[PDB]
Amino acid sequence: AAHVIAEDVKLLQFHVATMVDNELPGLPRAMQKSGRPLKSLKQRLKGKEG
Amino acid sequence: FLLGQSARDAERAKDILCRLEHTTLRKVTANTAIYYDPNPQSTVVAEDQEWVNVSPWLLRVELDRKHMTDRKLTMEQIAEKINAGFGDDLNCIFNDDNAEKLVLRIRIMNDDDVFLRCIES
Amino acid sequence: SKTYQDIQNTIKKAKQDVIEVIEKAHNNELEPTPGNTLRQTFENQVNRI
Amino acid sequence: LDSFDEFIQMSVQRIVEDAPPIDLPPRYLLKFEQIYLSKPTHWEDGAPSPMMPNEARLRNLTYSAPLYVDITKTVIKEGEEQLQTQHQKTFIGKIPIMLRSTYCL
Amino acid sequence: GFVGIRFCQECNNMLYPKEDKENRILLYACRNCDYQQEADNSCIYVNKITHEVDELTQIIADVSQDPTLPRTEDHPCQKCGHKEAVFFQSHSARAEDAMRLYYVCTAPHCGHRWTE
Amino acid sequence: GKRIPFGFKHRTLPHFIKDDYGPESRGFVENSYLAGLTPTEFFFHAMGGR
Amino acid sequence: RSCLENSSRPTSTIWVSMLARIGQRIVATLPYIKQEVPIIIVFRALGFVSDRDILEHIIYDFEDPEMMEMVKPSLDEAFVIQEQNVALNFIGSRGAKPGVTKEKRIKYAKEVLQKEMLPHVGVSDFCETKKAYFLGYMVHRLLLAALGRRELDDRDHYGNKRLDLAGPLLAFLFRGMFKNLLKEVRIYAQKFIDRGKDFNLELAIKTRIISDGLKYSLATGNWGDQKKAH
Amino acid sequence: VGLVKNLALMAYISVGSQPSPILEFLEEWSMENLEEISPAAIADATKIFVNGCWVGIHKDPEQLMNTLRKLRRQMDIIVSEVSMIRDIREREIRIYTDAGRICRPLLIVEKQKLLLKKRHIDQLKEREYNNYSWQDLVASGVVEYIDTLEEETVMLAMTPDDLQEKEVAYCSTYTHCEI
Ligand SMILES: [Zn+2]
Ligand SMILES: [Zn+2]
């Protein structure tokens, strides 16, 4: 459909990027449908207790 | 750390202290009253000094004494910095160092009303 | 009990000393120390006492 | 205790008497008024009986009391035919009660 | 001294100072209106850098009925001659360096205030 | 670092009177722990000990 | 922080601040406006076209020229807006959703000056004469704190604090939980009048909104909904 | 530390009341209402402020504060929680009736005496034998609930004898006394 592909990849981008960084500035955090945001790969090793 | 003879006497160390601290006009000035005195010999005020020195708006600026002395300044240097900072676009007419009030007078010479306020700030 | 008297006398002399500093400043005779305002020379005399 | 009693006695009849009436093709009125509250009861296969706080504490219940309001529905349409089919005491929810308040057993 | 705001007479808006470039005088014209009224102060803006304020101008006389404010009987009033007077310090922010006291007569219909 | 500050309007507690710079009115505890502290200076001693 | 009395509208805070520095311009930081608007613009939006009349609301003694020359700098600032209508267009041009037509923008700046800012003084049809007095009092009290005639307020004074006990703590919940169930009986009247059938409310009243919102926040401690508990 | 606190033993947190019988009273004293006032008459007149709302102007604030206070000491129009603050230096009377204001009870002191006289102690010793209680001390006009924004204009004595006796004067204008 050469127009929906654009939205498909925009949402693919959102998912593949919040997999490795859940905190983005100005971007909705990927939450689980319990209501809690995810622990991306960057958070598994970010700060203290990484 | 003071060097020579200034290191001993508190008097000759005090003018070093004056030669290092930042004094602007606001520390020595007391009252700034702009005026539209048109004829410079007319002088809406009691001052016989202009009449010995000779734009219609001035800045009568009356200075302070116990602030002018505690830094030891004379009106010649204020008058000189006052035209060296703004060049020859102004004409300060200072008082003498005998009178009781320490009045300066500025006048422009060469949206004109607010300009004495703009340069007095 | 002689020490108690010595102490009560020192403390009363001190409360008395700060009253005179307060009088002096209330009548404008506490001249500022050169380097301090009035409320700082006052507070310094008081804390010294 | 005074803060809670004032919540129950005024602030609930104030939150609900000032929420605006909802409407929606013809449209209706649906107005709320005059709330009531009862004492904490349990089975209200069982029969409604008062829960005592120590029984509520031992069975891991929640010492609460159920709230009722009286809603007048006015659905009104063409031909100028409205009915205030008013629903008395409609259950709204259960409100938990502070022990040894004016509304505790 | 000072200059006040002097308001227009037609639109009751604020009059600006404006120099009359023909007769050599100082005017006050408006922006919304065309109202020219003739000045008299011949002073435009004044500025107290010392910010010299007299506190006796700010003292209201109503302070004397303040239960929480110390009372003397050693300074009597000068208009009436009452014995009671309240006294307080400048009570102002921006108190430069002064712990000077101010007195008010504690007698109704007098409210005379003075400084020693 | 200063004496007890004017927390009410121009006084340190409501017991004192406006503009009281004296020793007792600004925090100078003049008892000892053996005699015990007066009520106002119990409070000022607590403000200090906080 | 202006608030009315446990209204479904929360607290809404003005700010009549003064800039550091012409110098000495007073601004206003109204709610639901992103930028700030000089105050004389607000007094004209509230409807005072004259300049003396704004000033009688701000300065009660016209006899001390001390406070006159402090509000001149902001009185010169908005000499470009003089009637009410261009004044609303100034504020209305700044909202969160600025209206594409002018008339949308004046309908905005008239609605925020009657319900968003200073509600406690009144949210009626005509209350500008007492929102004007209470605004001029806020400016006046700012000018007293700048002229140094009055001491600044201490944030720690317990006279400036209120405690929320188990009463308001719960009436803050029971407002949101009572709005959620009017959003539920709404959709349930909707899916049901549009079939053209008739709708019943016994099944529209979702009882698990109160009974479980209370029991949830009183159980975890999070004072909100479960969907936004972080 | 310092963020979590605790009430003192006799603190009462006020639960809140409606400002409408106050607004109605003040109207029929000599107030002047804010919308029928000439802006030239706020200069020498105290501004009245019920619950944060500037509703009114009054030309005589030594009769309001004494009437408002008599009227709380009887528990009739003003309930006992309401607090009237009179700022002398700026001309403002502020009346709060809202909730959440923490307050505490203080004995009242009229000239230099307390109002708590030996009758009340004896009647109060014979409580639980009939029915005399704290509410009669409040209704009779002996104790008062003063709170923190109003506590800034009381002149409070700490013990009653010893601070209301006669020496070189400390204040001699006490207005309350602590229990
Ligand atoms: Zn005009
Ligand atoms: Zn007198």
mmCIF file with all atom_site columns, C-alpha atoms in Angstrom, chain G residues 56 60-61 120 129-130 133-134 137 149-150 157-159 162-163 165, chain H residues 5 13 35 39 43 52-54 89-90 92 98-101 149 152:
data_model
loop_
_atom_site.group_PDB
_atom_site.id
_atom_site.type_symbol
_atom_site.label_atom_id
_atom_site.label_alt_id
_atom_site.label_comp_id
_atom_site.label_asym_id
_atom_site.label_entity_id
_atom_site.label_seq_id
_atom_site.pdbx_PDB_ins_code
_atom_site.Cartn_x
_atom_site.Cartn_y
_atom_site.Cartn_z
_atom_site.occupancy
_atom_site.B_iso_or_equiv
_atom_site.pdbx_formal_charge
_atom_site.auth_seq_id
_atom_site.auth_comp_id
_atom_site.auth_asym_id
_atom_site.auth_atom_id
_atom_site.pdbx_PDB_model_num
ATOM 1  C CA . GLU G 1 56  ? -7.447  52.697 40.823 1.00 0.00 ? 56  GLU G CA 1
ATOM 2  C CA . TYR G 1 60  ? -5.356  52.896 46.316 1.00 0.00 ? 60  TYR G CA 1
ATOM 3  C CA . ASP G 1 61  ? -3.570  56.091 47.314 1.00 0.00 ? 61  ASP G CA 1
ATOM 4  C CA . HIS G 1 120 ? -12.311 31.393 43.954 1.00 0.00 ? 120 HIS G CA 1
ATOM 5  C CA . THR G 1 129 ? -15.125 43.723 38.745 1.00 0.00 ? 129 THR G CA 1
ATOM 6  C CA . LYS G 1 130 ? -14.152 41.500 41.578 1.00 0.00 ? 130 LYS G CA 1
ATOM 7  C CA . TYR G 1 133 ? -10.002 43.905 42.481 1.00 0.00 ? 133 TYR G CA 1
ATOM 8  C CA . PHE G 1 134 ? -8.411  40.689 43.489 1.00 0.00 ? 134 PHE G CA 1
ATOM 9  C CA . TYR G 1 137 ? -4.518  43.375 44.961 1.00 0.00 ? 137 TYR G CA 1
ATOM 10 C CA . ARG G 1 149 ? 7.565   48.083 52.361 1.00 0.00 ? 149 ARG G CA 1
ATOM 11 C CA . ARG G 1 150 ? 6.577   44.606 53.399 1.00 0.00 ? 150 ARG G CA 1
ATOM 12 C CA . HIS G 1 157 ? 5.333   29.245 58.244 1.00 0.00 ? 157 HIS G CA 1
ATOM 13 C CA . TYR G 1 158 ? 2.668   26.820 59.347 1.00 0.00 ? 158 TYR G CA 1
ATOM 14 C CA . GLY G 1 159 ? 0.086   29.430 58.840 1.00 0.00 ? 159 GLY G CA 1
ATOM 15 C CA . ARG G 1 162 ? -3.110  23.039 55.365 1.00 0.00 ? 162 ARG G CA 1
ATOM 16 C CA . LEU G 1 163 ? -3.281  19.376 56.269 1.00 0.00 ? 163 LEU G CA 1
ATOM 17 C CA . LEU G 1 165 ? -6.830  14.433 56.496 1.00 0.00 ? 165 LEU G CA 1
ATOM 18 C CA . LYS H 2 5   ? 6.041   14.933 61.902 1.00 0.00 ? 5   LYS H CA 1
ATOM 19 C CA . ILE H 2 13  ? -7.137  20.075 62.958 1.00 0.00 ? 13  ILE H CA 1
ATOM 20 C CA . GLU H 2 35  ? -18.904 46.094 43.907 1.00 0.00 ? 35  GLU H CA 1
ATOM 21 C CA . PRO H 2 39  ? -12.116 52.995 44.495 1.00 0.00 ? 39  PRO H CA 1
ATOM 22 C CA . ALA H 2 43  ? -7.095  54.039 51.285 1.00 0.00 ? 43  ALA H CA 1
ATOM 23 C CA . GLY H 2 52  ? -9.046  34.265 50.662 1.00 0.00 ? 52  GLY H CA 1
ATOM 24 C CA . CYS H 2 53  ? -11.763 36.203 48.905 1.00 0.00 ? 53  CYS H CA 1
ATOM 25 C CA . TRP H 2 54  ? -11.650 39.942 49.278 1.00 0.00 ? 54  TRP H CA 1
ATOM 26 C CA . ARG H 2 89  ? 0.099   47.350 60.152 1.00 0.00 ? 89  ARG H CA 1
ATOM 27 C CA . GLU H 2 90  ? -1.480  46.598 56.841 1.00 0.00 ? 90  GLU H CA 1
ATOM 28 C CA . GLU H 2 92  ? -6.486  43.605 56.635 1.00 0.00 ? 92  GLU H CA 1
ATOM 29 C CA . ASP H 2 98  ? -11.851 26.255 55.692 1.00 0.00 ? 98  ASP H CA 1
ATOM 30 C CA . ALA H 2 99  ? -10.477 22.922 56.672 1.00 0.00 ? 99  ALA H CA 1
ATOM 31 C CA . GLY H 2 100 ? -7.083  21.638 57.446 1.00 0.00 ? 100 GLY H CA 1
ATOM 32 C CA . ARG H 2 101 ? -5.962  24.510 59.631 1.00 0.00 ? 101 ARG H CA 1
ATOM 33 C CA . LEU H 2 149 ? -1.961  32.308 61.611 1.00 0.00 ? 149 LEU H CA 1
ATOM 34 C CA . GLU H 2 152 ? 0.888   35.626 65.472 1.00 0.00 ? 152 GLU H CA 1
#
